Amino acid sequence: MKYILVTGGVISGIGKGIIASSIGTILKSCGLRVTAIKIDPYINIDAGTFSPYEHGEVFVLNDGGEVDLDLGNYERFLDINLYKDNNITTGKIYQHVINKERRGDYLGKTVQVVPHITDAVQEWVMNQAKVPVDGNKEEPQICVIELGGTIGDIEGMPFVEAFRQFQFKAKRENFCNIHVSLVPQLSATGEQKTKPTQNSVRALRGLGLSPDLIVCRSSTPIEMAVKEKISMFCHVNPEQVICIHDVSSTYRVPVLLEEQSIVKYFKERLHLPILFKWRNMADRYERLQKICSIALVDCYASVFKALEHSALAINHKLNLMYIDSIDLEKIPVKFHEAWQKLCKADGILVPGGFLGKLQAISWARTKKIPFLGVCLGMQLAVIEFARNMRLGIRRTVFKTENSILRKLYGDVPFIEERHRHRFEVNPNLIKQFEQNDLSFVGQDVDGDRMEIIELANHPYFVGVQFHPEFSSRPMKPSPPYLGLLLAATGNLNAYLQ
Amino acid sequence: MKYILVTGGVISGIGKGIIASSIGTILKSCGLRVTAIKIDPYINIDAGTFSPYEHGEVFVLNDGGEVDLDLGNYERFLDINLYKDNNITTGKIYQHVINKERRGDYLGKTVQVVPHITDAVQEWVMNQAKVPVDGNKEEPQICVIELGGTIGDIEGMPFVEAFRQFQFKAKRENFCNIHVSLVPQLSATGEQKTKPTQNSVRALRGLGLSPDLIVCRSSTPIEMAVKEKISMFCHVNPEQVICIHDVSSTYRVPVLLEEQSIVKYFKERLHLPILFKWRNMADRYERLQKICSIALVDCYASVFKALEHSALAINHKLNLMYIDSIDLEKIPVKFHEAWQKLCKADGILVPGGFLGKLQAISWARTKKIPFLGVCLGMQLAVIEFARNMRLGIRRTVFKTENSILRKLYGDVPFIEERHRHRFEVNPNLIKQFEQNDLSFVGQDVDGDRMEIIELANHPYFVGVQFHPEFSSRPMKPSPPYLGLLLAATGNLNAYLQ
Amino acid sequence: MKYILVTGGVISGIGKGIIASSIGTILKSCGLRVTAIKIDPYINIDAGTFSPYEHGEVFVLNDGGEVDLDLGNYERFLDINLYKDNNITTGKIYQHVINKERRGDYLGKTVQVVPHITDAVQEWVMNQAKVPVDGNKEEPQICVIELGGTIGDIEGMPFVEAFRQFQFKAKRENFCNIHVSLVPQLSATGEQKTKPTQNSVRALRGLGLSPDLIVCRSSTPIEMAVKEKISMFCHVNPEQVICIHDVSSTYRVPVLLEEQSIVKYFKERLHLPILFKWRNMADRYERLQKICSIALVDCYASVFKALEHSALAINHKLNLMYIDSIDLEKIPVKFHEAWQKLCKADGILVPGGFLGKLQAISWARTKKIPFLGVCLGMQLAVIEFARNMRLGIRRTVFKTENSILRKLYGDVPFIEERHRHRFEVNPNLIKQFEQNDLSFVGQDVDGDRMEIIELANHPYFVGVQFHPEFSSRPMKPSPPYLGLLLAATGNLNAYLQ
Amino acid sequence: MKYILVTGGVISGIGKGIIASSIGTILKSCGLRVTAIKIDPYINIDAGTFSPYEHGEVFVLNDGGEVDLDLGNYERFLDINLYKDNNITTGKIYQHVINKERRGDYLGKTVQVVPHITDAVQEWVMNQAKVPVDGNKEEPQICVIELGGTIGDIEGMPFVEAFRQFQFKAKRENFCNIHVSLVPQLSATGEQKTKPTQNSVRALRGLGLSPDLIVCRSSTPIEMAVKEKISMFCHVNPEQVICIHDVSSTYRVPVLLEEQSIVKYFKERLHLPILFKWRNMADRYERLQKICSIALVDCYASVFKALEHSALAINHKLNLMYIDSIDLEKIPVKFHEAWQKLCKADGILVPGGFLGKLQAISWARTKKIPFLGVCLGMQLAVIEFARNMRLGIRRTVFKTENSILRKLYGDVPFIEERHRHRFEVNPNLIKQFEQNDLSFVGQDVDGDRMEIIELANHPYFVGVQFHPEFSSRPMKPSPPYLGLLLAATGNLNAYLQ
Numbered sequence A, B, C, D: 001m002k003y004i005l006v007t008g009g010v011i012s013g014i015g016k017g018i019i020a021s022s023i024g025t026i027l028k029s030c031g032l033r034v035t036a037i038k039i040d041p042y043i044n045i046d047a048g049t050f051s052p053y054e055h056g057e058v059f060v061l062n063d064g065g066e067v068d069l070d071l072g073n074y075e076r077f078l079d080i081n082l083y084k085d086n087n088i089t090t091g092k093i094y095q096h097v098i099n100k101e102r103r104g105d106y107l108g109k110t111v112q113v114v115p116h117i118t119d120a121v122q123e124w125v126m127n128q129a130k131v132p133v134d135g136n137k138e139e140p141q142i143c144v145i146e147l148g149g150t151i152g153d154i155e156g157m158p159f160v161e162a163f164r165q166f167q168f169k170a171k172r173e174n175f176c177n178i179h180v181s182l183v184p185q186l187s188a189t190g191e192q193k194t195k196p197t198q199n200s201v202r203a204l205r206g207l208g209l210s211p212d213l214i215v216c217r218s219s220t221p222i223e224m225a226v227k228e229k230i231s232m233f234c235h236v237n238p239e240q241v242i243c244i245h246d247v248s249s250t251y252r253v254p255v256l257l258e259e260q261s262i263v264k265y266f267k268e269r270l271h272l273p274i275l276f277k278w279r280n281m282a283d284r285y286e287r288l289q290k291i292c293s294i295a296l297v298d299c300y301a302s303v304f305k306a307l308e309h310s311a312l313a314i315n316h317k318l319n320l321m322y323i324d325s326i327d328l329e330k331i332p333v334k335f336h337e338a339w340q341k342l343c344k345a346d347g348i349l350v351p352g353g354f355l356g357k358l359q360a361i362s363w364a365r366t367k368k369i370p371f372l373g374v375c376l377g378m379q380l381a382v383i384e385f386a387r388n389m390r391l392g393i394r395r396t397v398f399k400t401e402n403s404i405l406r407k408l409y410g411d412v413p414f415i416e417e418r419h420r421h422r423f424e425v426n427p428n429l430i431k432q433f434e435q436n437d438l439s440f441v442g443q444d445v446d447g448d449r450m451e452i453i454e455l456a457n458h459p460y461f462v463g464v465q466f467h468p469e470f471s472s473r474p475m476k477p478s479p480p481y482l483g484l485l486l487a488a489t490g491n492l493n494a495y496l497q
């Protein structure tokens, strides 16, 4: 296969995953079948071990893998369905080698990091690159590998050593390395400094990989004198020093890379047989004037992106105002902030988790303000109506054609969406609710779990057990989120017509 | 506790384990309770995964741990009984952290090498240092930690980072580092080169540990000009540059270290409240003239050491001539080497394993030459008499007082020795042999396994199921090995009188 | 002596020289005699080799040394008079060792970087620290050594190796290291990243120096979670992690360091027997409302600082608008910018160099707007009146008591100021001017060079051959600059009364 | 041009200069014009600064350059005449850049190691490679550059950075790197260790150069398992792992390299349009039985080599027994060693320097034992007969045809040989000697200095002012040395016939 490693320098928050995902959609626009692998040098096996504050949200894959939000960036940019083994971690590879050792698979030889851990990385990358990750069963052409962390962190040392070897245990026609690095810009002088990028490239080149492209991330576009220092000290041509400055949106990052001519580089280097929409979406995003103010009651990064996809599609600006449920709760300055936000809420969003959510539900229910409840927001909705693990892709069957979500999903009798919940509605008690305004509208194939609710005597009050955020992509807004913004702007009855 | 790290430079075969074990017996001669821990940066969990060619023999511990022969060096020098967790490996620590992660013991935080793997090393070292490893239940005073590998190998990087932190997460009064390094001596010029030791100390000091002692291993004693270069370039006083040259025996290495005044250094540095036998044994070893030629039919390092302990005790030189059983086998130049060695064999030794052993057994049996069979050498002896896992410490009961091994072990009704076998003698068939010359003399407490055989109509033909090698120490020769050399020299009937 | 090394991490523009100069004035406020040495790892011998665009202005010392502007920061903060050998460079030290080699001073031994270049650094630092650099002939107590560059640049490697050795070839009571490092703050998230500081401290600690204080430079004050990561990963206590954020002025940086308690650290560590004005000047600077707009017709950093000292003393804000003389020149958008700036010029400043300066002189002369000409601005003033190396400290004698500059300098018959010029006024032609409005008012002791001019029929049009900028300090504004701001605000005749 | 860098790993005494010189004579046997440059990272400018104990003898070049003996190895192997600038040193390059800086040749830019010192290395290497260093005025085809020191020493860091850049600022067709490294062989086990070579290649590859050949120096030929570890861990094919073991002679080292097929590698890699004598000389050397015992009364490495060239040519073994003149002196165990050696002296050799030499002269003179005096040995000979700087190539004119040295040099009226002396014979006093047995036979063209003496009433007692050692090569023995061995074996009168 053809392989593109993306390494990071100086600091991890430079957006390497957006760059890597951007080059993947560039290559896809050039007609290529692109895979992605993310290396996360953490010793954790799956992101289910994390808090939402640590690594952002737990993105959920079709196979039930729990991963950090950057596999959602590859899914959203490439329109791809990743498997749990497209995330490589140090825990996953060390445990693999330890298990092989105990099985005698290393034939009584001493197991050690080089070669055995480095071979495990190569074995895994070669095979997961070949996985059909598009819906097309045809073997991929390119694999973009993001090496997470910063080159020079101790946890990354097996992977760069593996990738050093992988140059030679392949061809230069088949492997290149992108180094993404911070070019810090000083306050008082405006001066862009190249020293961290030079030092990071020196470290990377000391690990036996050379930058084939250097991607500068900078606050402002870099000056030619700055690009000249980088091309001289990092021993790469000026045409191989790319600048991605702070832009308006992720839609503009692929467009910017065409305007740095990366396709000519990848054609020449990787010997490749080679956007519109990203321009259009960027150009639209920069012109969004009509505010839709929604109350959310990187912890919710797919939720925010799903709303922005929906907002863009209806040519509105999202104003996502985040409210803690403890602010709305009876426990008082932040109460008069939170409830004031909840007054100017055109829609209420109660996402998942593991108290004032119930008050926001009551507010939305009573005042007839548009509501989307996801996972816990469905369960709390059922609960508060009464007062007044299941992991990965599953089929949800609609119990009727008289469903607003069914119209938004395109009249289909069932949907396949991603789940992540341990708790569900009691099958014996459903007959308390069916008599009244809260219809249970979607169920599993087993008929035990109700998985969608709709409140009938309301513009749009829906609850879903699945996370339809993980299915959201710019080209196809997540229908439960689209319905929320359509309802909040009154356009729902025009769309459903 | 007080801690002594022993790091290695340039190459691992410099004898760091003998140096570390030597300083342990020095400190023990100074009256201190000494523990040992060995770090082996391999990803293997236990040495049962190894061939005998890889890491030498599998030493067996009382608890059934399978470890490399260097935990036998700490056992033999200190008269200590190590536990399986006095061996630290990368596999054992990474699996520990992975298991803690999956249990949620890191409270949703990202697990990473620093701190979490480095803390696991510190946690383990602090607690295993406190283990009563002598028979005395009193908590130890010093722990000698040998860091296996060479400082600068990638697998060693978590451990040196842990030990860097461990300086500061302790006191300088409680931690020091010994660096053992090759001083190569060139052929043509006789010139001793200090450059590898300087470069290795620069690497070690780049990992945030400084040599408190530098132990030069050299072929010849080092010149003062060589010691001056090391003390200048490695930034350590001349009194802290120790030379251990190629000596006669391991008995001389502690004695040499007194003659480099290390006790004064450890008294001053570690604030310690502070040999004869090692001199005596060294002085004896250098005067061994009477050859006992024994045929063995680092793969057998405890076997060789057990014979040398026995040889020294009877003031004989061992000539251990190693013969492959395939040389003795019918499959022919090496046949006339092997059988010629077997002709001048004063004793035959058939150690354990997993064909010409049977011929050597037949030879020894028929010609009435002294025989010791260990594990497989007992099983093949039973088999060839007929023609003509159980792991760690177990109690073997003697079935009679009429046992030669029972006299050698001191008339005791049972012995406790170390086992490592999956196969044993059939309890139904023992009644074929008891009628004849092959007595089954030792059994387990269960009475199912016969564990010792003695052939009655022979000077000394014994078979044992245990490995009594692992019990051998210079002060107390292993009785089955002592019996072999006593028999082979005719001194048996004088000893047993 | 007591020594404080100040090392830099990530990027050089973090202000290490202001931090180092700030701790020097802190220690001086604590009553200590402080020296400064600046190491510049460039191979250049003196800054006379530089353009003004490269390293900023060439600061001139009393002995005629040409140095970068950071020796002016030590002069301005400490009220000190540095010698040319308080600047150490790689060129100065390598040439020293090469010269010693050729003289046989190394006694036929091979000269090499360690030890001989590292010893040369130590020799130089020990002796220049002892230099009376105050006017007091008493030997100094502390020496602040700024190591220029970033730790990990190849040119800095001799100096950090020297300073590693210098810890041990001294006492910990007598040496400490401050590491100044960038904590980059990301745009989108507001997130302060500690990774470069951790990596830079790892590099510094790999060169055998540990941070005794870590000084974070950040745009905003750092959060406690950020300070905790630094104190954990850089293995230093929280009290040793200092934050200097972007402040109003250099006057506030010493004041901030008291509010980080550095005096307690230096008392404890360096065993020291231990501001008001800096608070007052900072507090004043933040309240400057009255604008004095001056046209200047880091290239002029002492000029700008001299104006700011003058501005602060008269409680005005300086608006220094910089105009290129080529903009004012007949060669046209920038002409209407430049001449528009020159219209709102309350004073014209024509500093030194090596064309529209003559037009600005004519403008100021004719319209009677306050003028200060320095070096070339005196020579061009003489020239344009007619139309209508001498290096370091020299004595200039006033030819009369009827001098405005003589009143501003305190009625004294001569002044001693710093010179840097190859050209001077023709002694035969002076009699053309003395007849008219342009008096030559200051001369050298030789009587050949006129060194000050004053135009009599004007509020304030003075020219000086010396650079009185280099003499400017916050406590004592440079009288030619003070006169300019006093004239420009009309306060001159109140001051001279 | 084509360039071959030769780097060293682990320790400098591995013989890199003999390897580099050997590949140069291989390429010369393939018909190529070969240059050599030696980089010595010492800060010394010329070896005239050294003692003879430090870097061995001072080799003298035709232009009067004073250099270490390794430029004599390139002269002897290639039959080449090196210039003083074929030795590059850190002193020579830093002084060059400092001088350029002071001249303004860097146009006011900050001079720093990268680029300016690294460019100076490249500039120098490119131009000195083009120097006609053979007598043929045609521009060379290959330049062998030995980088002295060990890769990873701090002084070598500018040169490896220059050579990293030089790969890219050339072509792979035009540059390759040979890494020479110690494979230490342990005493007790016979085990050859690859770890230092792996670590040294990791350091070298961290400086951005990869081994194109790895030359193992080992005591014994390396095993295939050892070559496999090196080829795996150093990421080079088995055919690129060369072993040079301890051999009989330098004559065998080129022959060994053909038997490792290096010409096939250099043909393929450097795109080259491509021994007998070295085999013959090696084969002869191994069969030398007839001892010629000569008393010498790396300090004298060209002297020893000149004797060995002479010995080989007359098919004798040299037994060069070295005697200190202080042993022969009246100041007594070593007296009876020294004079005993002087009794079995078939020839006396008194080489140059700066007391018992006079006694050895008297001994040789009186007993009529063959004598060669060089420089000081001529001056002391003149002196002791009476009792009983001029640097580089100079023309010496023979005063007569009646000269034994003139016959040995081939009847020529003058010779051109290399000089290094400050003292000479007094022109007024020569008329004391000419009357008697000591003829002055060679003079300079000036007629002031007598430069050769011959004692007439003796088999062979010659003194020369020049060092004819530096002219010695295996193909053409130095005639004054050849005469000594011919005289000492009685073959002189057969040769001179």
Ligand SMILES: CC(C)(C(=O)Nc1ccc(-c2cncc(C(F)(F)F)n2)cn1)c1csc(NS(=O)(=O)C2CC2)n1
Binding pocket: A014, A015, A016, A018, A019, A072, A073, A076, A077, A217, A244, A245, A246, A247, A248, A249, A250, A251, A253, A304, A305, A306, A308, A309, A473, A474
């Ligand atoms: C939330 C929003 C509106 C967005 O653009 N935010 C934003 C804005 C700017 C940048 C940015 C600025 N400069 C540089 C770089 C980098 F590239 F260098 F890092 N990034 C990053 N994220 C959005 C809608 S859809 C989406 N993401 S998404 O669903 O994956 C879809 C793309 C496939 N985000």
Ligand SMILES: NC(=O)CC[C@H](N)C(=O)O
Binding pocket: C351, C352, C353, C354, C374, C375, C376, C377, C420, C421, C422, C423, C424
């Ligand atoms: N210092 C300056 O401004 C230099 C002025 C002028 N070029 C001279 O040499 O006198």
Ligand SMILES: NC(=O)CC[C@H](N)C(=O)O
Binding pocket: D351, D352, D353, D354, D374, D375, D376, D377, D420, D421, D422, D423, D424
């Ligand atoms: N080269 C030498 O042997 C030197 C000889 C003597 N010291 C001189 O200067 O002439």
Ligand SMILES: [Mg+2]
Binding pocket: none
């Ligand atoms: Mg810069």
Ligand SMILES: [Mg+2]
Binding pocket: none
């Ligand atoms: Mg040396």
Ligand SMILES: [Mg+2]
Binding pocket: none
């Ligand atoms: Mg972080």
Ligand SMILES: [Mg+2]
Binding pocket: none
């Ligand atoms: Mg090995």
